[PDB]
Design an enzyme around this catalytic site. Structure first.
Site, short mmCIF file in Angstrom:
data_model
loop_
_atom_site.label_atom_id
_atom_site.label_comp_id
_atom_site.label_asym_id
_atom_site.label_seq_id
_atom_site.Cartn_x
_atom_site.Cartn_y
_atom_site.Cartn_z
N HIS A 96 -54.18 -108.94 20.83
CA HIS A 96 -54.42 -110.37 20.62
C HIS A 96 -55.20 -111.04 21.73
O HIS A 96 -56.20 -111.72 21.49
CB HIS A 96 -53.10 -111.08 20.37
CG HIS A 96 -52.24 -110.39 19.36
ND1 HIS A 96 -52.75 -109.92 18.16
CD2 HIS A 96 -50.93 -110.07 19.36
CE1 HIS A 96 -51.77 -109.35 17.47
NE2 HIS A 96 -50.66 -109.42 18.18
N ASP B 49 -56.15 -108.04 12.98
CA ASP B 49 -55.51 -108.61 14.18
C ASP B 49 -55.31 -110.04 13.69
O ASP B 49 -56.27 -110.82 13.64
CB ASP B 49 -56.41 -108.60 15.42
CG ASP B 49 -55.65 -109.03 16.69
OD1 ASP B 49 -55.04 -110.12 16.69
OD2 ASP B 49 -55.62 -108.28 17.67
N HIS B 50 -54.08 -110.39 13.30
CA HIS B 50 -53.84 -111.73 12.74
C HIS B 50 -54.23 -112.93 13.57
O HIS B 50 -54.47 -113.99 13.01
CB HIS B 50 -52.43 -111.88 12.16
CG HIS B 50 -51.36 -112.08 13.17
ND1 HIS B 50 -50.83 -111.05 13.91
CD2 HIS B 50 -50.67 -113.19 13.52
CE1 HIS B 50 -49.85 -111.51 14.67
NE2 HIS B 50 -49.73 -112.80 14.45
#
Lengths: 485, 485
Positions: free
Chosen positions: B240, B177-178
């Site tokens: 996110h 999950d950047h």
């Protein structure tokens, strides 16, 4: 805003303080509208001036702040002058009449303020006579604003106090300390009681130590005659520094009224530890400035009017301790001096570092809340955050805020605050007798050992932050000054 | 810096993520000196590329990240490519062979990282065959970097989890999950646990509510194909947003090791309230963007590829509730959407106002701590202080800090941070199964009522911050969004 109805009588109405601070302040209150029709200013000094000449003096002193001629003229017509010898009982009758004449002219009912801006020898004398000769009003209030100093030791002060109490009650006395009139100093209680996160942390469980710094770049200048007998100790520590500490160390009050504020401050001062000889040596440092880096910076002993064997202190650094649960073990560091690295009046609250280990190279350091009072108002909070590195590590960053241009233009100068507050009968920004007596008791113990030369007199080069003994003082507790110049 | 010895294989090594982010990131690791000599990167896709054109592909992509062309070429020489079809077990031998060749050519002893940057449907398959066709290294570690851990539904997500724990050990799984890789998201724990004043107030006695905003100014653009069925709910909220909430709501861990961090996070996730039908209607808002004031800001239903009947949500706002003692009664407000006023990812923690009576016109308001994650890192603290007026009054002031040029210039890109972490075998910044699981159940509960059309579909002007139902959500608790746009 509501009109303030008062009659103010200035003793020492021709001195520089009156000319450049007092009148312009009063004039500002006029521009703002607090002063309208029912008010009068009676100036008095020993020189043989007269009404016309006094109005002119005032006119010149406020020309720089005038919007228009008519405005200044309207203001000026509320002043009168009486030459007066403060020692001559009969002279008071002349003054009594000037006051009564003015009260009748502008229809003022009591509400008298007497501002003493004369040599301190006269404080007691003027006070007694104000009562005797019947200068005090029969209705409304009667208040006395007393300029510095307020004694030179506990004895002289107590004596002064006793004298003052002949015509006034302690709550009518307004001892002036202009630092208490500075805006930023008044932000302390707001910051603390207005933000639960700080309010709950304002005690020994979160605070490592408290630091108060009043440093100046200037030297003794041309006031050596007075300064050489006062030093940083009586000129900066006993009054300005101590009163700032009062705001910091106070307990939480019942409410925010002057009575509760003073009560809250008094509880702290009553817990202040008074030192003996060994302790003064252990907890305090006195120093005198040496040469600097330029031909402008002469060592103190080479300044004009400074006796060659002077052992006067131009710098003081010390630790105060309070015997109250709230402050168990938290040292309050205090320092003030001339010829230091920069001009700055600030408060730094050093919080204990956290114990949670991140397993990083640099663990969490102490957070710091800093309130800069002079030269420009600013508040900064040094906080632990993450470094910008490949491996997790902590660093310290500073969140900041400084007064806006608008804030600056709207900030009243300290003397305006003080005068206005006295007119409102608000003792919030004034020290009371209990506070002053403790400060004297505390400072006397120090002076006693200094005059007897029972403690070293350190040197420090002009332009630094003081003798190394100053740093050595905090180091003993694993502390360090946050402001390094 | 120490040389890292590793072999990373990229499935989907010709896709956009690889070209624009994966390769440039690995390059940064090389330039910084982590990747020296004992390393190889093996790429793989369906198309038949040869070593020359593949290396050329990498070159075009790190071109603007090279200062010295020589280091560029030196880096390039560590790449090899094999066309390969993920579903055909047979071609894995070609991959396996390529892997071993690069390993022996660069003397890399085990330590293999498999980056799955392909459609989710293929993850399970690739995993099984990685074990099956013996591609897993003998010595050292074997780690999987899964790009889309959530998959396309709880079922497939659970299924993939099943495959993975039956073939791999959990400490070898790196669910990406950047957002967790963003420098500012990683500052949250440092701020909280690194500062006692904040650590001690991180709960219901001091916090009024927490707000998380992920806003974008862009519309659906050219991704209607994917977006129309995903919506903000699956595109931004499920992933996110949830991961950010995790860092915020976590309990205080026993230590800062990924194991304790996960446990601390999971204590919050397992305490998250999952809503029934009535509750979704009460606590969530779904909306779709209408036309903006300007010309080309057309309604969502008028975008080139959006079907007439589309009921897709381009905006979600909702209230989360955690059943933990520290969070009892404090709502977590979350919002994300397209065509909002500005691009921004931030957290706002609203503190309960103090109750101290100053006797002023404006009593103490709520302090607010803001953490800006995008566009640029910044930390702000709105505090109560004194206003600049004649009478004592309070006002809020803002202390702020923002990343310096040096900070943003040394800040790793999220993908570099994540790849580096995986090499180090550190899972602190990766999602774990329990968090991913809970997020799914949480979202599915909402999707169910939405697909059944059992909740209203709101509209909002493009360029605003959303429908007023979003403001009504918070107003029900006497709260309001701090970020105004």
């Amino acid at each position: 805003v509501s009109e303030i109805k008062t009659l103010v009588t200035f003793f020492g109405g021709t001195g520089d303080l009156a000319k450049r601070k007092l009148y312009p302040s009063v004039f500002n209150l006029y521009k703002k509208g607090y002063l309208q029709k029912h008010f009068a200013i009676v100036g008095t000094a020993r020189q043989a001036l007269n009404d016309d000449e006094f109005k002119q003096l005032v006119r010149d002193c406020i020309k720089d702040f005038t919007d228009d001629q008519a405005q200044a003229e309207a203001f000026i017509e509320h002043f009168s002058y009486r030459a007066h010898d403060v020692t001559d009982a009969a002279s008071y009758a002349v003054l009594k009449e000037a006051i009564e004449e003015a009260a009748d002219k502008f229809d003022i009912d009591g509400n008298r303020i007497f501002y003493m801006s004369v040599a301190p020898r006269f404080f007691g004398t003027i006070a007694k006579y104000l009562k005797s000769e019947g200068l005090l009003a029969d209705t409304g209030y009667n208040r006395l604003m007393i300029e510095k100093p307020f004694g030179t030791s506990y004895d002289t002060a107590a004596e002064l106090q006793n004298d003052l109490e002949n015509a006034f009650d302690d709550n009518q006395l307004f001892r002036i300390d202009h630092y208490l009139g500075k805006e930023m100093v008044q932000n302390i209680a707001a910051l603390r009681f207005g933000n639960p996160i700080f309010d709950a942390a304002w005690n020994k469980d979160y605070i490592k130590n408290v630091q108060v710094t009043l440093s100046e770049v200037l030297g003794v200048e041309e006031r050596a005659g007075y300064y050489d007998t006062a030093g940083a100790l009586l000129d900066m520590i006993q009054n300005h520094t101590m009163q700032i500490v009062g705001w910091l160390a106070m307990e939480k009050p019942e409410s925010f009224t002057d009575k509760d504020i003073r009560a809250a401050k008094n509880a702290a001062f009553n817990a202040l530890k008074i030192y003996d000889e060994a302790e003064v040596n252990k907890y305090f440092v006195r120093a005198q400035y040496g040469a600097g880096d330029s031909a402008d910076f002469k060592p103190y002993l080479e300044e004009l009017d400074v006796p060659a064997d002077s052992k006067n202190n131009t710098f003081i650094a010390g630790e105060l301790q309070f015997d109250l649960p709230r402050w168990e073990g938290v040292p309050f560091y205090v320092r003030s001096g001339k010829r230091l690295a920069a001009k700055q009046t600030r408060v730094d609250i050093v919080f204990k570092a956290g114990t949670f280990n991140f397993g990083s190279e640099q663990e969490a350091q102490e957070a710091v809340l800093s309130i800069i009072i002079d030269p420009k108002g600013a508040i900064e909070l040094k906080l632990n955050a993450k470094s910008v590195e490949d491996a997790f590590n902590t660093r310290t960053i500073d969140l900041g805020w400084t007064v806006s241009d608008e804030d600056k233009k709207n900030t009243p100068e300290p003397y305006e605050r003080m005068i206005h507050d006295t007119m409102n009968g608000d003792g919030s920004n004034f020290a009371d007798w209990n506070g002053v007596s403790i400060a004297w008791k505390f400072v006397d113990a120090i002076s006693a050992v200094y005059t007897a030369d029972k403690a070293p007199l350190e040197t420090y080069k002009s332009g630094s932050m003081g003798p190394e003994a100053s740093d050595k003082l905090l180091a003993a507790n694993g502390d360090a000054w946050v402001f390094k110049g």
